[PDB]
Design a protein around this ligand. Structure first.
Ligand SMILES: *[C@@H]1O[C@H](CO)[C@@H](O)[C@H](O)[C@H]1NC(C)=O
Ligand SMILES: *[C@@H]1O[C@H](CO)[C@@H](O)[C@H](O)[C@H]1NC(C)=O
Ligand SMILES: *[C@@H]1O[C@H](CO)[C@@H](O)[C@H](O)[C@H]1NC(C)=O
Ligand SMILES: *[C@@H]1O[C@H](CO)[C@@H](O)[C@H](O)[C@H]1NC(C)=O
Lengths: 108, 114, 118, 121
């Protein structure tokens, strides 16, 4: 009972909703970042379990991917890490387009 | 026309096929890794933002409790080659939250067309 | 108003570190005891930036594990937190040793750490 | 083979020199970057690092920090020294580049990541 379906909030104030998880682990949702337009997300959970998803920013040329795992101790918490890819015009600048960080979500 | 649809290979010998990209940027595919149970085709799911647009996708390993996410951009250069420059995160499964610090690996991959 | 790295620090996972004086050129030395084979004090070596009239400078250091074939590097900034406290916000890389170049792809781990004064 | 001392070049055109490695694995050096993405005035910058010295029968891992002389940033690199499929000596590294932010609220966006392959000059 650490199911991803429902509403989540993070340490920076951002929100996300995740809908039902189908028999093959897939799910859909929305993400609202606190630092802003709803943007759709798409992902998968392995069949406690680990999971990944992609967020296609509706207001920026970027993409973010998240991966993580759901825990209990219980309070439920998703521990994630992400990559944020910026758009560059030339291949010469590719070296500077990827940022990395973390995020901890708890239920809303 | 640096379009993701088709077949790709990487620096480590892995393959992937990506199907058509719908009006909302979404796509589906398969990934066969040359390196590590034993290895199997695994499905992938992702999205492209909407000439050299950025993209992301998740791979759900059919043979392991892990998950990998890839993000990148499609370029043309240097010699005229189409190339996807990616970075990925590979998340392993842990039993306790105390070991979470140790569960994420990071690297890169360059794909060219097959 | 400034944020000096000299002294003793603890983190979110229970680990400790001591950092000695910072010389005129930003260099420093220290020791690292990780809370997470048997664990031992390990030396660290690093630098802090000294560019503009800057009171929260960035910095980096390397830890040479005395009990493992690995290496970790940390990089961050020193803040005066909202609460008057001093805090180091860091990210790290942990590199394992592999025997062949073919396995290099799987040798690097990444995470974070927040340190506060002891 | 595979001793870090000497001169190196990378895939982006940058250079670095590393001096002698003492008994405790420490070393010093210099880094000249070919790319700034800033208002240049690019300059030699000093580096400091360490190489591991447990079980000397394969190639050891190492880390170092670069203190940019022209920018408020810092980069750290970590990696291992190999002999490659082609007979070359090669350092495979990954790095983190930390930018300076003014408030703690913007910390989440201050770290970039990538890779670099060095071969001897
Ligand atoms: C998250 O939800 C709260 C209400 O539950 C809302 O006020 C907040 O603005 C949301 N976060 C963002 C960034 O929209
Ligand atoms: C990928 O496809 C290429 C050519 O079609 C082949 O050489 C290679 O063996 C395939 N690799 C895997 C891991 O499926
Ligand atoms: C770090 O210092 C603390 C002081 O709170 C002490 O309890 C502990 O012995 C030290 N940590 C480790 C892991 O040795
Ligand atoms: C690196 O060194 C070579 C010769 O030793 C020099 O020609 C080259 O310009 C250097 N790279 C940079 C970007 O300064």
């Amino acid at each position: 009972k650490c199911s991803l379906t429902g509403k989540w909030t993070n340490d920076l104030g951002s929100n996300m909703t995740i809908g039902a998880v189908n028999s093959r682990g897939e799910f859909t949702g929305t993400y609202i970042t606190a630092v802003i337009k709803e943007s759709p997300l798409h992902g998968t959970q392995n069949t406690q379990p680990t999971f990944g998803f992609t967020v296609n920013w509706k207001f920026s040329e970027s993409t973010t991917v998240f991966t993580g795992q759901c825990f209990i101790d219980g309070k439920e918490v998703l521990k994630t890490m992400w990559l944020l890819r910026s758009s560059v015009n030339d291949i010469g600048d590719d070296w500077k387009a990827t940022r990395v960080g973390i995020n901890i979500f708890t239920r809303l």
